[PDB]
Amino acid sequence: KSMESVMVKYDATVRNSINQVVQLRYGEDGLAGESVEFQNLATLKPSNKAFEKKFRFDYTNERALRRTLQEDLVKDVLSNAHIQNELEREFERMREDREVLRVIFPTGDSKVVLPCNLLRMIWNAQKIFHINPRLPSDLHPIKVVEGVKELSKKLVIVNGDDPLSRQAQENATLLFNIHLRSTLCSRRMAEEFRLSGEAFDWLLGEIESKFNQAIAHPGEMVGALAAQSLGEPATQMTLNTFHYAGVSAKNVTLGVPRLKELINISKKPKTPSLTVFLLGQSARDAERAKDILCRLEHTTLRKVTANTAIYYDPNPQSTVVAEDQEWVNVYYEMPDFDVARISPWLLRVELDRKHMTDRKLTMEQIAEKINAGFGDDLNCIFNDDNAEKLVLRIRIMNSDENKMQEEEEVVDKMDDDVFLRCIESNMLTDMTLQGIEQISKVYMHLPQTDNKKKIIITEDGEFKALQEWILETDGVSLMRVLSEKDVDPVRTTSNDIVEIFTVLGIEAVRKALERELYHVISFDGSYVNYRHLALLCDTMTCRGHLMAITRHGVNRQDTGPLMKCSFEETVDVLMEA
Amino acid sequence: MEPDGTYEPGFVGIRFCQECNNMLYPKEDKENRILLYACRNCDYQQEADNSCIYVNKITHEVDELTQIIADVSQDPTLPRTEDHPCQKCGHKEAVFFQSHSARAEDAMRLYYVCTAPHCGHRWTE
Amino acid sequence: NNELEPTPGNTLRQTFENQVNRILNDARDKTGSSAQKSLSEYNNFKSMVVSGAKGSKINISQVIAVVGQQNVEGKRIPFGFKHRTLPHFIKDDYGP
Amino acid sequence: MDDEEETYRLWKIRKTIMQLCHDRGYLVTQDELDQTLEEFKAQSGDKPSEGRPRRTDLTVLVAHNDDPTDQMFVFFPEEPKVGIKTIKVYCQRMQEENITRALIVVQQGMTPSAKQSLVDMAPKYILEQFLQQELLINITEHELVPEHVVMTKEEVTELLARYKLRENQLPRIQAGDPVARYFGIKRGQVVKIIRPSETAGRYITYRLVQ
Amino acid sequence: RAPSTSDSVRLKCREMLAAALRTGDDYIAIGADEEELGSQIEEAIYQEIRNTDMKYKNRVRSRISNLKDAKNPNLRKNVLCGNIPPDLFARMTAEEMASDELKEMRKNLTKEAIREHQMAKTGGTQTDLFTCGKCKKKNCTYTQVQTRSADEPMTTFVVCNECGNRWKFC
Numbered sequence A: 001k002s003m004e005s006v007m008v009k010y011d012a013t014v015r016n017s018i019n020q021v022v023q024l025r026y027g028e029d030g031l032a033g034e035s036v037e038f039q040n041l042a043t044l045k046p047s048n049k050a051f052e053k054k055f056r057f058d059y060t061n062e063r064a065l066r067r068t069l070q071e072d073l074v075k076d077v078l079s080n081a082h083i084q085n086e087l088e089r090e091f092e093r094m095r096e097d098r099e100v101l102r103v104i105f106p107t108g109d110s111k112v113v114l115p116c117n118l119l120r121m122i123w124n125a126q127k128i129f130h131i132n133p134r135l136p137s138d139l140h141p142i143k144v145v146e147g148v149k150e151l152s153k154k155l156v157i158v159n160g161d162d163p164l165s166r167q168a169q170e171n172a173t174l175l176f177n178i179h180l181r182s183t184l185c186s187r188r189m190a191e192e193f194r195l196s197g198e199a200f201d202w203l204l205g206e207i208e209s210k211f212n213q214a215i216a217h218p219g220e221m222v223g224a225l226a227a228q229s230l231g232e233p234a235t236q237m238t239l240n241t242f243h244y245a246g247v248s249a250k251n252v253t254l255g256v257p258r259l260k261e262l263i264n265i266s267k268k269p270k271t272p273s274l275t276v277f278l279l280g281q282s283a284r285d286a287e288r289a290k291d292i293l294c295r296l297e298h299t300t301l302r303k304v305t306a307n308t309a310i311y312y313d314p315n316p317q318s319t320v321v322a323e324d325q326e327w328v329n330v331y332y333e334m335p336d337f338d339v340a341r342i343s344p345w346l347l348r349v350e351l352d353r354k355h356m357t358d359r360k361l362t363m364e365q366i367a368e369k370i371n372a373g374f375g376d377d378l379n380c381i382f383n384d385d386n387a388e389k390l391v392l393r394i395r396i397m398n399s400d401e402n403k404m405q406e407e408e409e410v411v412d413k414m415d416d417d418v419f420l421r422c423i424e425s426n427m428l429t430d431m432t433l434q435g436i437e438q439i440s441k442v443y444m445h446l447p448q449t450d451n452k453k454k455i456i457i458t459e460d461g462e463f464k465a466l467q468e469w470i471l472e473t474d475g476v477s478l479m480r481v482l483s484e485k486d487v488d489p490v491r492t493t494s495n496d497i498v499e500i501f502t503v504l505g506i507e508a509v510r511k512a513l514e515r516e517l518y519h520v521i522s523f524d525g526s527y528v529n530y531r532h533l534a535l536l537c538d539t540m541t542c543r544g545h546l547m548a549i550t551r552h553g554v555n556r557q558d559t560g561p562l563m564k565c566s567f568e569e570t571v572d573v574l575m576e577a
Numbered sequence B: 001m002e003p004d005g006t007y008e009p010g011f012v013g014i015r016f017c018q019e020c021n022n023m024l025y026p027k028e029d030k031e032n033r034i035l036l037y038a039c040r041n042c043d044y045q046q047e048a049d050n051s052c053i054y055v056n057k058i059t060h061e062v063d064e065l066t067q068i069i070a071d072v073s074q075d076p077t078l079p080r081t082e083d084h085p086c087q088k089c090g091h092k093e094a095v096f097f098q099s100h101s102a103r104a105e106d107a108m109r110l111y112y113v114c115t116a117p118h119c120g121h122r123w124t125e
Numbered sequence C: 001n002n003e004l005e006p007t008p009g010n011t012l013r014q015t016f017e018n019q020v021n022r023i024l025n026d027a028r029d030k031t032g033s034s035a036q037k038s039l040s041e042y043n044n045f046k047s048m049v050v051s052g053a054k055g056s057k058i059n060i061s062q063v064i065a066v067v068g069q070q071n072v073e074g075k076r077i078p079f080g081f082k083h084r085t086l087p088h089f090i091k092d093d094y095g096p
Numbered sequence D: 001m002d003d004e005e006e007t008y009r010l011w012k013i014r015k016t017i018m019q020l021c022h023d024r025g026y027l028v029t030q031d032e033l034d035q036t037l038e039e040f041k042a043q044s045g046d047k048p049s050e051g052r053p054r055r056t057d058l059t060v061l062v063a064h065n066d067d068p069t070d071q072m073f074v075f076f077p078e079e080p081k082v083g084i085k086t087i088k089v090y091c092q093r094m095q096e097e098n099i100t101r102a103l104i105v106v107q108q109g110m111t112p113s114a115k116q117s118l119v120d121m122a123p124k125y126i127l128e129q130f131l132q133q134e135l136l137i138n139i140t141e142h143e144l145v146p147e148h149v150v151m152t153k154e155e156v157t158e159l160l161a162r163y164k165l166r167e168n169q170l171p172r173i174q175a176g177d178p179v180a181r182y183f184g185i186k187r188g189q190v191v192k193i194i195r196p197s198e199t200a201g202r203y204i205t206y207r208l209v210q
Numbered sequence E: 001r002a003p004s005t006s007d008s009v010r011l012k013c014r015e016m017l018a019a020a021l022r023t024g025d026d027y028i029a030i031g032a033d034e035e036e037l038g039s040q041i042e043e044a045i046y047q048e049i050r051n052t053d054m055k056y057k058n059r060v061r062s063r064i065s066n067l068k069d070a071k072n073p074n075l076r077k078n079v080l081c082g083n084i085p086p087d088l089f090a091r092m093t094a095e096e097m098a099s100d101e102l103k104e105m106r107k108n109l110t111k112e113a114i115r116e117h118q119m120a121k122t123g124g125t126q127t128d129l130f131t132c133g134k135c136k137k138k139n140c141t142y143t144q145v146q147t148r149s150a151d152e153p154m155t156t157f158v159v160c161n162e163c164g165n166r167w168k169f170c
């Protein structure tokens, strides 16, 4: 009911009913989903030396019969300077493309959907023409090179005699074009496929015909088609089956309940989280990670306290708790005048040494935190860190000068013990020592020895992966977690969408929402073609603000009343129209 | 002094009023360093003993050998054990079981109850 | 004996429940792998599984080797009764 | 506070606003771009904390994009919540200096009358609002956020012509959007978004601000 | 030779530090000048705070209490014999300095256990059967879901976490 109005138009930009543009060519590439197939990208080749060895057409040819193998032609072209510059013009471009392709697929995955299986077609050329895999050919490499240039010009998906249109053409076939050129390189043909010249000529004619056929048909109801294609695997597998993994788990709702949660643009996800990455020494040391985690972990004093007590002791220098007597020796000079002013009601707190250690927190920071929060009125003193018992001693002070029973004391004679309980109620529930805001008691400390992350480039050129620490967190405060020191502000991400929008802005939602949908579908194991998912997310963000696909989402769209009545609200919308 | 000294200062709720039998609340005498407990509806007041009026979170109540009433041993569906020697009487036949609570929180520790009339004695392991 | 020593990311109860589940799953998988191997070439059952027609390795495991740990809501059978699953068992029996 | 960590925060928001100025096209020293916290600690003399300039001397002028429309000015107020009075005094300083554009980086909250008055002065002179937390990082370097290019009014004219569209038919972006706010782009203008792709490999889209 | 002061508060804090050093009379079996050393301690603290602030007083007082420890006199002896200069003493070498057995061991083993609460976080699925079709490692996971079915029957899906590769019994 949301997508239905979206279709390919005859200029090929996919638009909805009110004619607004959804995409500029269908699914970002002009290609229909019926005739695309999985293919490998040779060019993501690991070591720089192996790539250079494999792809570069040799000129430092062996003085022996060299080259009369594979080709009978090179006796003709071993002397041409121009042919050497032109192939070098080809390889430097390949090496430049190679650099661009690494930026495109940071994951170092070489499996992409494309039309027209070039290995199987090339394999089909060898089969038909009956080409001996171990003989010299009559093929000319410049013919291949120029033929590939000529074939790229031939493969136009939308007209472009205009510089903007010319650029739109160049990028919209970039991935196929590097794939074409890297597979159909002069050395590839020569060292491997051994194709003859007419065989190459047929091969161009075949790639040309199947590619042109592949393009999407204007008129296709791709909006209707995409909605069912996503809809269908949602019917399949897992209502709410659990998958044991690492420490984590009661994490990220899986499947249809996650599809409903995601697609409704829920303000209150059932399990919101952020995957936080670490930097410097903190990305490889457990104890450093412990320190950053401690700053992040939203701990409240109630979590920390072993015990509380309230005591009636007007004068410390005669303490009811005889063991406390030494702090009085310790704290006689602590504002010695207002011991005549402090209330005879005493609060005592006992702290656990193991739990206090885990937060790596000090007693002075707590005294200073509570003193600063409540104010100078809340008079706090504390113990020696090396004592076997950890204690915090609390009294309550006033403003001295103004309290002389002027009228009747604007407090209405509230009991002071009772007020001390309210201090204890609030002091525990409010005080956010080291940990700031709601990420809750729940943290996870994960080693990514697991999946496909923390990988980079190296001097070898290969995608050697790192194994590093990360922090999964049940929480929402994405904004603050980014602001903290040593947290990687690049890769840190969330499964939540409302928060991603507030912090990162509408384009980031388009990416994250596609990723989250991609993630539920991969779990359930079934694969869905990328075009369909791109179209759904693009349909939802187009208005600018997220359009949940519910009556409070899509039925606010400026589409016509007669469409909107057939959705859900019916009578009310017709009345409002 | 020593940290071995148990923590039971006297929680104490009731010692309510002696006249109308309602609840007593602390209240101050700034003149004599004395706590008093007063009924809110009458003029009766009396000094308190301990200066303690409230504590919270012993956190470790071990409730391991308390509330667990000895008559539990008659239960036929609990596992009798040949594991011998009650620690009081020279007879085996301890009945045993986990936790039996929601406040236990994660205990796997066994509790043993001797079942012959000579004890009723209970003990953890 | 209270000597199990909890895993760094669970409570003592959760570690036990994880650990027995790991062993009982490990047990089914060993006996399951053992039957698929012990079978010959003529077993029509192997002909239906191998072609990809119907069923699966785990199906073979269940008819011949051993059915394994039943489940509900992602964990072992609940204590429907007070500290028991059926009246037939002793109280607090955490065995298989 | 009264701690060195605060300096790091001041340093870090200084780095982000300089990158932002740079990305709007304004000329800035690469040495300023590279300026580290330890360099800053001497180069501005963030003293020992207590003793001077909380956020009044850090105040900086930024001087012009390749097209000389002349300076931009960036101000860091001191108080946690800024009132219309301080904005007005600031306004007097920018007017007397005859500034072209002002960016205001506030400590915590915002007076609603101040935002309103900030709204109402807009047709006369133009004026931006950032909360400091949003500047503690640089969102443009996040792994999800694509390359945004503001288009010049003429290039948009060519865009509508070559596709034969109308501005209304385009995909839209909020004016109050964090990336829209980051460029400080005003309503009615178009932003060109460049993305990585799993099929074309590169996909180009446009968004109207509204 | 240590600089005297004309402030009453600093002078009193000095005798308190001297008084703290006099505990157990350990200074006697060494015969050191605990009053001068205390004055150097106070001055060294003053060189960092330069104020009569609570934070200065607390730092002095926490120095005092740690010197007053009955569980570790050997710390005080170490300070009294001049093995720990006052400028060093001005800053803690450990949280509440507890070196010299007992508490350091206890604090360290506690540092072991709280670090132990992160160590394995907890991981694995446990089968380690199939070998990957990409990074050729045998550490792999399997999924078992929806039985009977219509056209996609219950199949064993195997995923290599170790590089996100996914396949079926196939």
Ligand SMILES: [Zn+2]
Pocket: E134, E135, E136, E162, E163
């Ligand atoms: Zn691998």
